DNA sequence: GTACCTACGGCTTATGAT
DNA sequence: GTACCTACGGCTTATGAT
DNA sequence: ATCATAAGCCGTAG
DNA sequence: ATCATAAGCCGTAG
């Protein structure tokens, strides 16, 4: 059974290539700037149980069960992005703290996945908060027998404060990192009026910032980046001249992403070709101080120009092309600072929404249930008669829902909202009804519920159900009440996790 | 080359042996241990292959094993193994690297191509059990009108016997050279990938 | 800081070594036959809950669980020792039932330890038969902070069945596989008669018995090894002459351990070689029908020398070293046959005694609580008050307690023995008084203990406690009911897992 | 050999630098990272090394590097690496490399180890933390009186600096060559190898 | 995605030497 | 216990050629 | 005196 | 005509 096929069908599979791979492998998202790989391993993170207050744990249980459960593309890669997460120069705020050897800027790879140990970081539970509310959708695993969130309930913008780069088949993308209070600053400004420009933003937020710290010479480069969505931008490292009371070239910090072996041994190398003028020897003294490379300035020379072209001519200045490509509503678009924000609010207040709207609907049973427990704790002589009599659980509770009850005036809200939506009006019209739910309730108390020290505790935990219940359904009435909600937990998100700019922006 | 991969069945005449190509030791095993001793053969490889568009140079050889083994390129002077079929993974990496073999089939050899010798393999897809009930599936539309296996080397070879390399089950498939167009020029120039995927 | 040290620390150091092969690595012990990593595996899959009627497993989760928690000493050799478990041909009762290329007789390695799935067998549970009961003593794990079990509660004599090859540092052993109902047949009868000799046990003991069936030559090997603890043993292939209605050799099956692939081609090389005449060429016809190997003798040949020849040069015959060393009480000793059953049948008396002590307990225990539920289920109305009346929850329980109880006359067992050993003389002299355990118990009642349809149930299970724990201190009594037990245990066993004999030994 | 693994330091004249033999990529790394920079030097090895009495063959050489790097080999004549230490972990294959890396050094150059320049190393074993009370334990009497690091490859390199190559806090240990007995003669014989252990 | 090097003892084969 | 080979795009440096 | 061509590196994946 | 010596392989481990 052979059938003849076209040679076309080449094209077909191919093609579907490059749909798994735009999609769901490398450009992150514009909601929580997050590759799956990252999504699952946190998610992972999080179903084990291992928060940041609690012991270590080895890499091989994590490892094991993201490859067995939620992420069937090997080990290697998983434990490489691993290793790149808990770097610190690496990400301008790390997600996963750990213990043992993540290499260095030397170029030096980590060690094997059986000493180093990981937890989650404090920020880290910041991107996972409010998980199990039922905030977003969940989808099936490989096959189909597992729950995976869709997107993060994110609080932190991370596509602009740690950025990504990732190579698609006919795409590619690159973003710089920021500050966490700037950005923060930005949006409270947007929020403030919705119709602002480009110049404000500019003014709010300087510009990028890196791990390792070091100066930025062109304004127009970033100008032209934000403005319309690509542009290059020049790195310098710092150095200086010095003299005592003759010359000499002092290095404190270099570009990003930089072997720091490799810098040293190509300027050796330079020297020994004669290419560059007025260098005699080279030496490190890089301690727990700070880095520090000394440079010998040769006799008779003024080094400046040494350093000029050097400049010129080392990795001590490098280029960066900033390009920003990221998924919309699953296709990628070219999108400047002003769309990112938008986007991130909008999730912001879906989220929002759809938290109230949860936590409402539990209240409301809770108080659908507690009610009834009081009105049974109310009448309590006949209800033993009527138990004691009955002989069949089935025929008791049949028995406690056919009859009416009395509703001791002790016992007796809202005009209405304290009772569910699906309940029918036929129930608790003092006149009152049952419902099978409360029945069983009922008859699921203890002992312990008969003293005079819990019937005050369910008054009290009665009116305060309902006044949380008022809370929500106000905070759902209006929008400037969720706004203002916005406002303050962002707010508070500033105070908590701030920090200082680390490069600066000289113009040229 | 001739050793240490390849494992030649017993027959000698051509035109009635066989010939595969999957992923190396995950797969070879299995298709090994389940395949027929007398007019079948197996040839695993690493890993992926470089295109011969994006980078042509014919210094550029690294593994070379196919163009040993098949022929001695100048192809129609041996003919020897007068069938060959690929066979590769449900997975996107198994339609990626069978399109980088057909490209190298078509840019290096077009006679071999031209003459209906190419054949590409259909394995399941899907094993459903309702109790005594069993059925495979080998599509997605069949799975639509009515277990996952993601890797050749993961069902049992008896299993792959059944349904794979049966001269009475199997389902092949055949490869033509109907015209001369420029697909395969779009393949690799960075501005025909940038427009072609506009699949909205 | 420089002390002086002596060079006879070498010595010390080396020892530790030494130490650490012989008891905690190679040599199994007498009592289950088991190497500690396979013990450790084994605990880790039982403790993750996979079971045999479930659905299987990736190896990642429980490689990855093991190198985790209880064995750090990296992935590669676990994952071998598994594979080595689930092959068939290497095994003669596989324990780890698997799904996957685990390679064949032809020496092709198995798959990578991402496609794989794995599960127990029916018969690994027989290994683990009552492991929670407090059965045997746990020690910590590599950082004291787990428990692990030192010995597993057997039911199969396993170092008969299966055996072991290791190497230590000073001693090396090696013991062959046996049959199952043989070997049950022979601890019946050391069971029957406690003075048994050797030639008994030989009498139900045939010989030894392969995977891979195969025939033996020598009976004195044999007995030279189980009479004293070292021996030779012979094992031949099966093959036999033919000649159509030319002559042909036809071989159905190899040795134990011999690669085929191997073998064919070493005879390719002999027949090049010159070194052996009468062969024309060599043909493999394996299929799913049986190994089935082909040799076409050259005319004009009897064949027979031919076969002669190839069983003195040939691979076709080899010989196997029996040699029984393991652990007693922690230190190697050579030991033969009876005591391996001596050792075996203490095992398990020890077991079923600790198991009837700690059942026995806890059905005490049980029926402790439960008089007490009775007696406040008979009054049930001034209960009512005092809790009413009583305002605090621990004042209620400090007043169950002051007072004596009436003991209804619906309510009112063994003359003792129905009440627990740490309780004093003063609870229970109807008069009646309580306990602060059992005041809580009452105190934890609910309202579906009050129908006419729960005081019945009660009652029953009242009266099976009381039946079970006197059947309980029965069979702690005296011997000849535990021994009878074990006897019933061995024989069940016997029935579930037998089958037939494989290989056949013929005398010389 | 010279490049490849070894990091030497600045400092030239012997007699004052230090060399460190390790396990290689889990510990080299973190001792590479955490060492000093003026006269520190790092060889990492690879697993295991063969005897030298159980198979004896002047051609039987696999990785020499020690060889070329420490001299020329004839010791006096050069005499490089005036000091140097020997650091392994505190499991039992730690001893098992110590006793053969030991060996090796007495039956190659009996100068070398009896002038006093080999040195042995005392990583701590346990880190006690109660609150702000922090204990560095060294010893199992130690532990006895009052987290278990099971590799050098584990612990933070500034913590090695403080704990294991501090030129202040360190705590060496030297060997000498007091008799000239046949221990190592019964270390491979199979024989005292099979009486020896006898500890009861 | 995949190949090489080591330790531990007890068995064989293979080879040139009194 | 440890090293090499591949794909995808956008940047640099390095080199001999109109 | 200017330009077409060929190499490394960044990150998820065989 | 007989013998001391040197090599592969099996399984948990660096
Ligand atoms: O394939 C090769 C070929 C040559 C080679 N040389 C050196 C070397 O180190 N390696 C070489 N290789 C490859 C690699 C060995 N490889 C084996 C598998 C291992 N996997 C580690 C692992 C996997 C899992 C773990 C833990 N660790 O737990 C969860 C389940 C999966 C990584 C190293």
């Given amino acids: 059974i052979t059938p003849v096929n076209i040679e076309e069908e080449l094209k077909s599979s191919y093609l579907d290539y490059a749909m798994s791979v735009i999609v769901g492998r490398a450009l992150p998202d514009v909601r929580d700037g997050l590759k799956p790989v990252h999504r699952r391993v946190l998610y992972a993170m999080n179903v084990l149980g291992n928060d940041w207050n609690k012991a270590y744990k080895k890499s091989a249980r994590v490892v094991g069960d993201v490859i067995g459960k939620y992420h069937p593309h090997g080990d290697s890669a998983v434990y490489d992005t691993i290793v790149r997460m808990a770097q610190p120069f690496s990400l301008r705020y790390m997600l996963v703290d750990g213990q043992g050897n993540f290499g260095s800027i030397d170029g030096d790879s980590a060690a094997a996945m059986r000493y180093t140990e990981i937890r989650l970081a404090k920020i880290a539970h910041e991107l996972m908060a409010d998980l199990e509310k039922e905030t977003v959708d969940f989808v099936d695993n490989y096959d189909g027998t597992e729950k995976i969130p869709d997107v993060m309930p994110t609080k932190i913008p991370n596509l602009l404060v740690n950025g990504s780069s990732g190579i698609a088949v006919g795409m590619a993308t690159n973003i710089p990192p920021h500050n966490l209070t700037e950005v923060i600053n930005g949006c409270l400004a947007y929020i403030d009026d919705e119709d602002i420009s480009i110049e404000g933003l500019m003014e709010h937020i300087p510009g990028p910032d890196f791990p390792t710290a070091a100066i930025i010479n062109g304004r127009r480069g970033i100008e032209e980046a934000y403005r319309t969505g690509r542009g290059k931008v020049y790195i310098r490292a710092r150095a200086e001249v010095e003299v005592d009371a003759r010359e000499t070239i002092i290095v404190h910090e270099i570009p990003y992403q930089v072997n720091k072996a490799r810098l040293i041994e190509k300027i050796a190398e330079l020297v020994k070709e004669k290419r560059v003028e007025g260098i005699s020897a080279l030496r490190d003294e890089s301690d727990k101080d700070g880095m520090r490379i000394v440079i010998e300035v040769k006799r008779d020379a003024v080094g400046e120009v040494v350093l000029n072209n050097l400049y010129s001519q080392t990795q001590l200045q490098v280029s960066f092309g900033i390009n920003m490509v990221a998924l919309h509503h699953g296709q990628p678009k070219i999108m400047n600072l002003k769309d990112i924000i938008a986007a991130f609010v909008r999730h912001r207040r879906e989220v929002v929404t759809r938290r109230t709207i949860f936590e409402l609907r539990k209240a409301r049973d809770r108080a659908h249930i507690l009610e009834a427990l009081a009105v049974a704790l109310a009448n309590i002589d006949p209800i033993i008669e009527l138990i004691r009599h009955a002989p069949t659980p089935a025929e008791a509770k049949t028995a406690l829902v056919a009859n009416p009850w009395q509703l001791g005036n002790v016992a007796a809200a809202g005009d209405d909202a304290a009772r569910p939506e699906w309940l029918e009006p036929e129930f608790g019209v003092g006149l009152y009804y049952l419902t099978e739910q409360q029945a069983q309730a009922i008859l699921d108390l203890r002992l312990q519920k008969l003293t005079g020290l819990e019937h005050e505790k369910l008054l009290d935990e009665y009116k305060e159900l309902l006044d949380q219940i008022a809370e929500l359904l106000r905070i759902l009435g209006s929008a400037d009440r969720l706004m203002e909600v916005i406002r303050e937990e962002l707010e508070l998100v500033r105070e908590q996790f701030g920090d200082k700019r680390r490069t600066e922006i000289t113009a040229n | ?200």
Same sequence: chains 1, 3.
């Fill in chain 2, 1 to 200: 080359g001739l050793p240490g991969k390849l494992a030649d069945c017993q027959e000698r005449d051509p035109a009635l042996s066989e010939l595969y190509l999957v992923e190396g030791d995950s797969a070879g095993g299995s298709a090994k241990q389940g395949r027929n001793r007398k007019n079948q053969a197996i040839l695993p490889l690493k890993g992926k292959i470089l295109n011969v568009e994006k980078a042509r140079f014919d210094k550029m050889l690294s593994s070379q094993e196919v163009a040993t083994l098949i022929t001695a390129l100048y192809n129609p002077d041996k003919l020897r193994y007068h069938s060959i079929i690929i066979m590769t993974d449900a997975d996107v990496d198994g339609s990626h690297i069978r399109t980088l073999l057909l490209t190298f089939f078509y840019r290096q050899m077009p006679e071999i191509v031209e003459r209906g010798h190419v054949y590409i393999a259909q394995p399941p897809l899907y094993k459903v059990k309702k109790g005594k009930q069993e059925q495979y599936i080998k599509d997605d539309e069949a799975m639509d009108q009515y277990q996952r296996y993601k890797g050749l080397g993961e069902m049992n070879p008896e299993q792959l016997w059944e349904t794979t390399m049966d001269p009475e089950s199997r389902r092949m498939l055949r490869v033509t050279v109907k015209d001369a167009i420029a697909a395969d020029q779009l393949f690799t120039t960075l501005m025909g990938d940038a427009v072609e995927p506009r699949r909205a």
